[PDB]
Amino acid sequence: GAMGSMERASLIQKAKLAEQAERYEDMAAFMKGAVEKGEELSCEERNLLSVAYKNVVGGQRAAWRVLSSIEQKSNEEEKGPEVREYREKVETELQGVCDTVLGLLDSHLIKEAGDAESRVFYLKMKGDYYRYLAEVATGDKKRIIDSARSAYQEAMDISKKEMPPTNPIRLGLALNFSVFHYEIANSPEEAISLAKTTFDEAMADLHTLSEDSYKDSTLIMQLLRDNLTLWT
Amino acid sequence: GAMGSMERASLIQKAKLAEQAERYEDMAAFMKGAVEKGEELSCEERNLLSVAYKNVVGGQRAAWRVLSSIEQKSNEEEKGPEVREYREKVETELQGVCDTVLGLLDSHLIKEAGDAESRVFYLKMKGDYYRYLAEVATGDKKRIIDSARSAYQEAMDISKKEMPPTNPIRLGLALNFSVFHYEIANSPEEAISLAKTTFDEAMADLHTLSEDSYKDSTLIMQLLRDNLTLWT
Amino acid sequence: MRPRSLEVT
Amino acid sequence: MRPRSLEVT
Numbered sequence: 001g002a003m004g005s006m007e008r009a010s011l012i013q014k015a016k017l018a019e020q021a022e023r024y025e026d027m028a029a030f031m032k033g034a035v036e037k038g039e040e041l042s043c044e045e046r047n048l049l050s051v052a053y054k055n056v057v058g059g060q061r062a063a064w065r066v067l068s069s070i071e072q073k074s075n076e077e078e079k080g081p082e083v084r085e086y087r088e089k090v091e092t093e094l095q096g097v098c099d100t101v102l103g104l105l106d107s108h109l110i111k112e113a114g115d116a117e118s119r120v121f122y123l124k125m126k127g128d129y130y131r132y133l134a135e136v137a138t139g140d141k142k143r144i145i146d147s148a149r150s151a152y153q154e155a156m157d158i159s160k161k162e163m164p165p166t167n168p169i170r171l172g173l174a175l176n177f178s179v180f181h182y183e184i185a186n187s188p189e190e191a192i193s194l195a196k197t198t199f200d201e202a203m204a205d206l207h208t209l210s211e212d213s214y215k216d217s218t219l220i221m222q223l224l225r226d227n228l229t230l231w232t
Numbered sequence: 233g234a235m236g237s238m239e240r241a242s243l244i245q246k247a248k249l250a251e252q253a254e255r256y257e258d259m260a261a262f263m264k265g266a267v268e269k270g271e272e273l274s275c276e277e278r279n280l281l282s283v284a285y286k287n288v289v290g291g292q293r294a295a296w297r298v299l300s301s302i303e304q305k306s307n308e309e310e311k312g313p314e315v316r317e318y319r320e321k322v323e324t325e326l327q328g329v330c331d332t333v334l335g336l337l338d339s340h341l342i343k344e345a346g347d348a349e350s351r352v353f354y355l356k357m358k359g360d361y362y363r364y365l366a367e368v369a370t371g372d373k374k375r376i377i378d379s380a381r382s383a384y385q386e387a388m389d390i391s392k393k394e395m396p397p398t399n400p401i402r403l404g405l406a407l408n409f410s411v412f413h414y415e416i417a418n419s420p421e422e423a424i425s426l427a428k429t430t431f432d433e434a435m436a437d438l439h440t441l442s443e444d445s446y447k448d449s450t451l452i453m454q455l456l457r458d459n460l461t462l463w464t
Numbered sequence: 465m466r467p468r469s470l471e472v473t
Numbered sequence: 474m475r476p477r478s479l480e481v482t
C-alpha cells in the first residue's frame with residue numbers, strides 16, 4: 001500500500017482533514033492505510049472508515065443509476081456501445097470499491113472484533129457493501145444477495161442479544177436490513193414488519209436515555225418512520 | 233494516453249454522459265482524449281472541455297482553501313507536519329490539473345484557433361488556469377501572475393475588436409479578468425472600472441438581441457453587478 | 465421513490 | 474466575501 005510509510009496517527013489526522021475538505025477518495029485511502037496497520041479501530045475511527053467509503057460508493061451508485069436509466073431508455077434510436085461501455089466502467093469501479101471494503105472486513109477487522117459495538121458495526125458494513133454489489137448484479141446475483149442477508153442476520157442476532165433497542169448502531173442496522181428486504185430481496189412485508197417493530201421497541205426505551213442519546217436515537221427512528229410512510 | 237484507442241465521437245458522447253452522471257474527472261479525461269485527436273473543437277466541444285476541467289479544479293480549489301485556512305490557524309498547539317503535507321498534496325494535484333489544461337492549450341489548441349470565438353475562449357482559459365496557479369503560488373509567483381495577465385489581455389484585445397459588447401464569451405472574459413485584477417493583481421480599482429465599463433457597454437447593446445441572446449448576456453451581467461455590489 | 469438508508473456524517 | 478467568476482454549466 002502507498003500508505004505503508006505513513007504513521008497510523010498521521011493517517012487518522014489526514015482522514016479528518018480530508019473529511020473537512022470533502023475529499024472522500026483521499027479520506028478512504030487514508031482510512032484503508034490505517035486499517036492495514038493491523039490494530040483494531042476505535043469507535044471514532046470506525047465512523048471515519050464508514051463516512052469515507054459511504055461517500056465514495058455513494059457517488060458511484062448515483063452515477064451508475066443515471067447511466068443505467070439512460071441505457072434502459074436506449075433499449076426500449078441505436079447510438080452504439082458507448083452507454084453500455086461507460087455504465088460498465090462505473091460499475092466495475094463501484095464493484096472494486098465494494099471488494100476493497102469487504103476485503104478489509106475479512107482481513108481482519110471482523111475476526112478481531114469481539115465487542116458487540118465493533119462486531120455489529122462491521123457485520124452491518126459487510127451487509128451494506130454486499131447490498132451495493134447486489135444493486136448492480138445480473139449474472140452469482142443470488143449468492144451476493146445471500147451474502148448480504150447472512151451478514152445482516154448475524155449482526156441482527158448479536159444486536160438483539162447485546163444492545164438496547166435504542167442503540168444507534170442497532171437502529172441503523174435494522175433500517176438498512178429493512179431497505180435490503182424491500183429493494184433487494186423483494187420482501188416488502190418483511191421490510192415493513194422489521195421497520196415497525198424496530199421503531200416501536202425503540203420508542204418504548206427512549207425514557208431510559210439522556211437528552212443527547214435521545215437525539216441520536218430519534219434521528220434514526222425518523223428514517224424508519226419516513227420509509228414506513230413511503231411503503232404504506 | 234489511455235484514450236488513444238477510443239474514437240473521437242465516442243469520447244465526446246462519453247463526456248456528455250459523464251456530465252449527466254456528475255463524473256467530472258471522467259469527463260475531463262474523455263475531453264483530454266478528444267483534444268489529443270488533433271482536430272479543432274466545435275463550440276459545444278469547447279464548452280464540454282471547460283465544464284469538465286472547471287469542475288475538477290473547482291473541487292481542488294475548494295479543498296485547498298479549507299486546508300490552507302486550517303494551516304494558517306495552526307501557525308498563529310503544534311500538531312506536526314500533517315496539515316502542511318496534505319495541503320501540499322492537494323496543491324500539487326491542483327497544479328497538475330492546471331498544467332494539463334495549459335499543455336492542451338499550448339499543444340495545440342490556441343495556435344490552430346483563428347476564429348475570434350475559439351481564440352478568445354482558449355486565451356481566457358489560459359488566463360483562468362494561470363490564475364488558479366497564482367492562487368496557490370508563493371515562490372515564480374510574479375511570472376505566473378504576468379502569464380495570466382498576458383493571456384487575459386490578448387483575449388480582451390481580440391474580443392473588443394471582433395465581438396459585440398454583449399457576446400457572452402467577451403462578457404465572461406471581462407468578468408474573470410476583473411476577478412484577476414481584484415483578487416490576484418491587488419488592483420481593485422482596475423477590477424471595478426473593468427466591471428462597470430463592461431456592464432454599461434453591454435446594457436447599451438441589449439436592444440440588438442433576440443430573447444434567448446438577451447437571457448445569455450443578462451445572466452453574465454448579473455455576475456458583474458453582484459461583484460460591483462460586493463466591491464463598492 | 466427510493467427509501468432512506470442510514471445517512472452517514 | 475469571494476467574488477463570482479464565470480459559473481460554467
Ligand SMILES: CC(=O)Nc1cccc(CN)c1
Pocket residue numbers: 046047048050051124168169170171172173470472473
Ligand atoms: C458513520 C456511521 O456509519 N455512523 C452510524 C451511525 C448510526 C448507526 C450506524 C449503523 N448502525 C452508523
Ligand SMILES: CC(=O)Nc1cccc(CN)c1
Pocket residue numbers: 278279280282283356400401402403404405479481482
Ligand atoms: C462552459 C463555459 O466555459 N461557458 C461559458 C459561457 C459564457 C462565457 C464563458 C467565458 N467567456 C464561458
Ligand SMILES: [Ca+2]
Pocket residue numbers: 007008
Ligand atoms: Ca508507527
Ligand SMILES: [Ca+2]
Pocket residue numbers: 239240
Ligand atoms: Ca477515428
Ligand SMILES: [Mg+2]
Pocket residue numbers: 189
Ligand atoms: Mg400485506
Ligand SMILES: [Mg+2]
Pocket residue numbers: 421
Ligand atoms: Mg477609489
